[PDB]
């Protein structure tokens, strides 16, 4: 059961007696979308300061494990431990992250962390193609709007930061009205609330800055061509649904219909996905996957693919977009029936895995928007209630003759112009 109390800070807890671990954490409603192009990467630097050697050493001496996660809409700082020592994690979180920040922002520590983060971002930008392609897709989809800033930070901006930027961001965003205290695993809600009440655990006053511009989607493309690479990596997307939309689960199911494909695994060549019937003959791709990502203001629905067949890219894109076209007009009931159970198993593993850190992140990110956490059972009935008419109604609105965003790198010379791709979003025979 999920129990949430608004006394003090918003305290959420999900109790699981079977687990042998307990996680206690703080989730902030600010993310990479709350920063600007001149201090971009301040959140990643804060994360790596919390994860620095001295802080991690003092934590691990007591027997605790530290996790930090940076995203568009939230920042997560989690302390995981054994069930008997769940009170010690609160003490470490109070003493280190909240009460005092002078020790963590010393000159030498800041310089070392800055040099390590610069090295990491430099390695990412050159030797991680499928993920940086998705980052550029975000950066070109939401350009000149908060949601397009990369979460790690750019190489040029990360140099200009000083400790003053970090402390300014901490003053502006680490607030009581922006925070949720989350408890996961083998702990009780009453015990957690009592433990918080015994201490003060006050973060700050409130009134975080309000953004003047809301995120917007622009049809656009960016091409980063490099002929010294062996493949071509391509990510393509349209505007999707945000969190708290009525069509959220319909979006995830429509994504699940096409699924993912790996050419080298024997089993995934026999899937009921009809798209493979066009792909398999000439080995058009090595792998693809479909995504329905949702944020607070907007979302992305699309796919990502990698291939060595540098002379047949347009055929791959054409067949994929013709499979997308089929959703509006001629989706069949068996497709939806398979999609329901595939999605239920897909959602089942996500929310019911052994690791409590994923549960903590999900619960903290959920209560910061909805105000409450949807149960597993009520999720299934909405999934089971989906019909063919709903899928057709959603697809006729979100992907029929709509603008797209594209991002590719590698031997993308075979990738045709924008308009030729944009015309594939309709059939013209219907």
């Amino acid at each position: 059961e999920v129990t949430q109390l608004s006394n003090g800070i918003v305290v959420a807890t999900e109790h699981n007696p079977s687990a042998h671990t307990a996680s206690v954490g703080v989730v902030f409603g600010s993310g990479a979308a709350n920063e600007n192009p001149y201090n971009n990467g301040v959140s990643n630097l804060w994360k790596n300061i919390f994860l620095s050697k001295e802080n991690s050493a003092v934590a691990a001496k007591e027997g605790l494990a530290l996790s930090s996660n940076i995203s568009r809409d939230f920042q997560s700082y989690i302390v995981s431990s054994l069930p008997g020592s769940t009170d010690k994690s609160l003490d470490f979180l109070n003493q280190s992250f909240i009460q005092q920040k002078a020790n963590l922002l010393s000159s030498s520590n800041f310089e070392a962390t800055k040099k390590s983060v610069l090295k990491q971002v430099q390695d990412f930008e050159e030797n991680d193609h499928p993920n940086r392609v998705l980052e550029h897709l975000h950066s070109t989809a939401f350009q000149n709007t908060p949601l397009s800033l990369p979460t790690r930070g750019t190489l040029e901006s990360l140099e200009n930061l000083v400790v003053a930027d970090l402390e300014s961001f901490a003053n502006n965003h680490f607030l009581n009205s922006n925070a949720v205290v989350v408890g996961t695993g083998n702990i009780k809600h009453e015990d957690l609330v009592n433990s918080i009440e015994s201490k003060n655990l006050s973060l700050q006053t409130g009134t975080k800055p309000v953004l003047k511009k809301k995120a917007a989607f622009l049809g656009s493309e960016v091409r980063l061509r490099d002929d010294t690479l062996p493949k071509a990596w391509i990510s393509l997307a349209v505007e999707g649904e945000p969190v708290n939309s009525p069509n959220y689960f319909v979006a995830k199911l429509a994504a699940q219909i096409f699924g993912s494909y790996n050419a080298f695994e024997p089993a995934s060549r026999l899937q009921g996905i009809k798209l493979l019937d066009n792909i398999q003959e000439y080995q058009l791709c090595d792998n693809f996957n479909h995504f329905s990502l949702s944020y607070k203001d907007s979302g992305l629905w699309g796919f990502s693919t990698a291939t060595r067949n540098v002379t047949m890219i347009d055929d791959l894109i054409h067949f994929t977009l013709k499979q997308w076209n089929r959703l509006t007009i001629s989706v069949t009931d068996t497709e939806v029936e398979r999609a329901k159970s595939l999605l239920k198993l897909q959602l089942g593993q996500l929310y019911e895995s052994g690791n409590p850190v994923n549960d903590a992140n999900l619960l903290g990110a959920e209560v910061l928007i909805k105000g409450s956490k949807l149960s597993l059972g009520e999720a299934f009935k909405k999934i089971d209630a989906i019909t063919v008419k709903d899928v057709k109604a959603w697809a006729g609105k979100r992907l029929w003759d709509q603008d797209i965003a594209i991002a590719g790198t590698g031997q993308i010379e075979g990738l045709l112009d924008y308009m030729r791709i944009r015309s594939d979003m309709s059939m013209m025979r219907w």
Partner: protein, 45 residues
């Protein structure tokens, strides 16, 4: 649990039928446009 087929499904023929009538209606409109000035077809024009 099997639908009548010949490489073309029965379910997919009923899904295209409303559009097939619309395409048929769009074709008659194209016939009157291209066969205007025909005196015999002017009997119903």
């Amino acid at each position: 649990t099997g639908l009548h087929f010949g490489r073309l499904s029965l379910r997919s023929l009923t899904a295209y039928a409303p559009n097939l009538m619309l395409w048929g209606g769009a074709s008659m409109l194209g016939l009157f446009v291209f066969t205007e000035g025909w005196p015999k077809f002017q009997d119903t024009l």
